[PDB]
Amino acid sequence: DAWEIPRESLRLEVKLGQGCFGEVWMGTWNGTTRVAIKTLKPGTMSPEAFLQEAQVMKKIRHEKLVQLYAVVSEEPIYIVTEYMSKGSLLDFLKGEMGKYLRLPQLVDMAAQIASGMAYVERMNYVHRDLRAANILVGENLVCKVADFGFPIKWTAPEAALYGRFTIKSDVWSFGILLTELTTKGRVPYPGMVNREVLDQVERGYRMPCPPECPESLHDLMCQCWRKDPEERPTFEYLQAFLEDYFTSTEPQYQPGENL
Ligand SMILES: Cc1nc(Nc2ncc(C(=O)Nc3c(C)cccc3Cl)s2)cc(N2CCN(CCO)CC2)n1
């Protein structure tokens, strides 16, 4: 394979996170390139399974999707990608940077996500787990979709009920992701547990306009949360709308205490 690299060229420097199937490190590839490394714990998940994510990441290439660099496909396995220096968008949003972000910065982060998701849309792919926790941040507020291989509060009804997952339910999640960006990281449907979210959402309920969030962005949310998956906007739409936001939609926008 072209993506193969010598085990020697990889250095795992800082441990970044853990899971049941492996770990994620910051490190150095060929002694020069800062990379992110993800490992599989031999025996926990099947190699074939843990490699299905890298196989996918091979046919994908977009500036708003985390990029594969190399793999070591013989146990123990390592997948290598570019390194995002700020971690998940969810830790960023509720961390020290939280308090300085306003609408322009947040609507721009959203746009990029929609740009990456528009690419995913174009390729007829589905993500299935779009949400802030699965967006990585970089230098200068660069946001890239991550993880290409239950989150009920993020999942569209038809997908959680009848397993009908699509780019249109991905759009639903994006709608839920917009509340995360506007509440600076707060769990959707506050004080509601999974079971009553299903009931309520199936009964027509939708989260209201977050504090200081312009109505125009709440409407955009509500469009992504239409009951009929086909009514829901495309990503190519969502992308254009958010890039043009402060000219075409909210030109009279004044800074507030939080947004
Ligand atoms: C969990 C985490 N990841 C970071 N960067 C990453 N880049 C890419 C990642 C990744 O997993 N790639 C990947 C791979 C390798 C395989 C398949 C699929 C994918 Cl997408 S993880 C940075 C970070 N930091 C901790 C907190 N710090 C506080 C600063 O104030 C900043 C730095 N923590």
Residues 50, 160 within the same domain: no
List the Cα angle 161/90/111 in 5-degree steps. 80
- Give 125 Cα–ligand 1 centroid separation in angstroms: 23
Spatial distance between the Cα atoms of 131 and 224, rounded to a whole number of angstroms = 14
Residues 3, 63 within the same domain: yes
Residues 33, 150 within the same domain: no
From residue 131, alpha-carbon distances to 7, 75, 91, 128, 202 in Å are 33, 31, 12, 9, 20
Residues 78, 89 within the same domain: no
Residues 94, 78 within the same domain: no
Spatial distance between the Cα atoms of 258 and 151, rounded to a whole number of angstroms = 27
| Residue owning tokens 């993800």 | 38
Size of the chain in residues = 259
From residue 48, alpha-carbon distances to 45, 57, 161 in Å are 9, 14, 29
- The DSSP 8-state label assigned to residue 246 in this structure reads I
Q: Residue with the nearest Cα to atom 27 of ligand 1?
A: 86
- The number of CA neighbours under 13 Å toward the Cβ of 183 is 18
Angle between helices 167-182 and 215-224 (to 10 degrees): 150
Spatial distance between the Cα atoms of 155 and 67, rounded to a whole number of angstroms = 25
Spatial distance between the Cα atoms of 44 and 122, rounded to a whole number of angstroms = 34
Residues 49, 89 within the same domain: no
Q: Is residue 258 part of a domain?
A: no
CB 240 within 8 A of CB 259: no
Three-state DSSP class for residue 87: strand
- Give 36 Cα–ligand 1 centroid separation in angstroms: 6
Q: What are the structure tokens assigned to 246, written together?
A: 């402060």
Backbone angles phi, psi at 89, to 5 degrees: -65, -25
Spatial distance between the Cα atoms of 116 and 85, rounded to a whole number of angstroms = 19
Of 83, 108, 135, the last residue of a domain is 83
Contacts made by residues 197-201, CB under 8 angstroms, sequence distance 24+:
197/152, 197/153, 198/152, 198/157, 198/160, 198/161, 201/157
| Residue owning tokens 């020069």 | 32
Which atom of ligand 1 lies nearest, measured to the CA of 80?
A: 15
The reply to whether 252 sits in an annotated binding site is no
Give catalytic status of residue 129 as yes or no: yes
First to last CA, the chain: 48
CB 210 within 8 A of CB 93: no
Burial of 247 (0-12, 13-18, 19+ CB in 10 A): exposed
Q: Is the CB of 38 under 6 A from ligand 1?
A: yes
Spatial distance between the Cα atoms of 239 and 51, rounded to a whole number of angstroms = 31
Pocket test for ligand 1, best of 81, 96, 142 (most atoms within 8 A of CB): 81
List the Cα angle 230/231/237 in 5-degree steps. 100
CB 86 within 8 A of CB 80: no
Catalytic residue among 129, 170, 199, 228: 129
Q: Which technique?
A: X-ray
